Amino acid sequence: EVQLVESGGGLVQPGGSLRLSCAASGFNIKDTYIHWVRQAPGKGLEWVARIYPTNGYTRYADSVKGRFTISADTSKNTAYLQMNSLRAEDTAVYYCSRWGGDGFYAMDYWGQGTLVTVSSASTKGPSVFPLAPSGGTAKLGCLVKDYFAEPVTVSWNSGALTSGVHTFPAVLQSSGLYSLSSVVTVPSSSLGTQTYICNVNHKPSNTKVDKKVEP
Amino acid sequence: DIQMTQSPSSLSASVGDRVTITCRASQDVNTAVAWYQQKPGKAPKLLIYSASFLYSGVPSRFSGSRSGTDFTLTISSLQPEDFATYYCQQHYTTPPTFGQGTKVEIKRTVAAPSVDIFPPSDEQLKSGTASVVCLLNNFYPREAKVQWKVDNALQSGNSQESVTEQDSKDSTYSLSSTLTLSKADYEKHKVYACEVTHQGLSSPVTKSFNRGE
């Protein structure tokens, strides 16, 4: 199966550097073009750069020309976006994709994307606080608070529970740290007999927390 | 630099409806136009390549059409999972360039919020902050008024809302309103109320709790 896996996102100070990777499986990058496309918050898609890994011919959008270098290594089947002099507008989710070297002359597979946050603020792990489940139906949650930068992944019961989950988009508080809540809807008859945990994960701060939620 | 001018920037349409999105190239691009569907916080998926060809695996209700420099994506009958932002992209020349996207909302019947109120957790007051969390569930339309009263007094500036993306099956929204108070402040008022005005509600529903009970 064709797959493009990205890594290297994170928090960067204004003026700083960050190197993204886009690792490919299920085909040869030497067979195609690899692109980087970015999406600034609540904005559209923006092409960033492309490379032909067989010769290293590269093209750049002008807004990153000079500051960004695209490159590939055909023995790791991986391509790279070295960014330097990052400014605040560069904050975006960076996707890679492949050009339809085989048939369809379009971007047919994509990476999952990696968030890049250009900001002076520093990392901070969240604190995870239960939302107390106070016969019809009942609801209970986990409040993830005061962290930076994005993102946090939260699952319920180590991933087993998926229905009725509602993980809200992170909102930025006046302090400059994000907060969000993740809430689930449960049957009343399950209270107590079934025990509920959330697996909050904030990779930039090595924060993995499971907080049991009970009445 | 060829520009793809996409319209409308957003639209609302009932399930089953026919939906057409337009991209206009600023110069001839032949058939080198692609159309992509992007669910929020997901990689774009390719729907149509070479202006009119269904990429393998895409449902048949998607189609693309060309009239000179005018490109049209059509969804013949809308499904709730089609909620997404749609982008056209030209690759005649370099730089390949996107339209500014069309955000497609599903229009559905009025559904009233079920609203719940959560007191701060004990670990939270230990650390010195108080977060009261008011939860409006599975409502349509998005427009909603969440009001905080403490001791029957109208709050302003200490709360913040967050809305889920439209649900891909029932097309409803969910919203959390969080009141942020210093622990001292939370400990200096008794009644904590959340009152929600929504079209599906005949009278605003207020959900209260009393500190320490």
> A45 vs B119: CB contact, 8 Å cut-off?
no
CA distance B4 to B35: 12
CATH 2.60.40.10 domain residues, chain A: 3-118, 127-213
Q: How far is CA B147 from the centre of its chain?
A: 21
Domain over A3-118 is classified CATH 3.40.50.150: no
Nearest chain B Cα distance for residue A109, angstroms: 8
Side chain identity at B148, as an amino acid letter? Answer: W
By DSSP bridging, strand B19-25 and strand B114-118 are: unpaired
CA B28-B95-A109 angle, to 5 degrees, is: 105
Between strands A137-147 and A127-131, the pairing is: antiparallel
Contact present, A143 and A136 (Cβ < 8 Å): no
Nearest to A47 among B32, B97, B160 (CB): B97
Within 134-153 of A, beta carbons closer than 8 Å to B belong to 134, 139, 141, 143, 145
DSSP state of B184: H
Residue bearing tokens 């409803």 = B172
- The closest of A119, A133, A93 to A178, measured between CA atoms, is A119
Domain A127-213 homologous superfamily, CATH: Immunoglobulins (2.60.40.10)
Encoded tokens for A52:
């032909």
- B contacts of A170 (beta carbons < 8 Å): 162
CA separation for the pair B163, A177 (Å, rounded): 18
Q: At what resolution in Å was this solved?
A: 2.6
DSSP H helical ranges for A147-208: none
Compute the distance between CA of residue A185 and CA of residue A192 in angstroms, rounded to an integer: 14
Q: How far is CA B1 from the centre of its chain?
A: 31
Tell me how far apart the alpha carbons of residues A79 and A179 are, in angstroms, rounded to a whole number. Answer: 34
Q: How many angstroms separate the CA atoms of A94 and B108, rounded?
A: 33
**Residues A106, B38: C-beta atoms closer than 8 Å:** no
Residue A132: which of B121, B161, B174 has the nearest Cβ? B121
Q: What's the rounded Cα separation, in Å, for the pair B135 and A139?
A: 9
Rounded CA separation B196/B213 (Å)? 23
Residues of A in contact with B34 (CB under 8 A): 106-107
How many whole angstroms separate alpha carbon A67 and alpha carbon A47? 15
Using a CB-CB cut-off of 8 Å, the residues of chain B touching A129 are 120-121, 123-124, 131
Q: Domain extents for chain B?
A: 4-107, 114-210
Closest residue in B to A185 (Cα) is: B137
Query: Which of chain B's residues have a Cβ under 8 Å away from the Cβ of A185?
Result: 137
Which CATH fold topology does B4-107 show?
A: Immunoglobulin-like (2.60.40)
Query: Which amino acid would we find at residue A55?
Result: N
Superfamily assignment of B114-210 in CATH? Immunoglobulins (2.60.40.10)
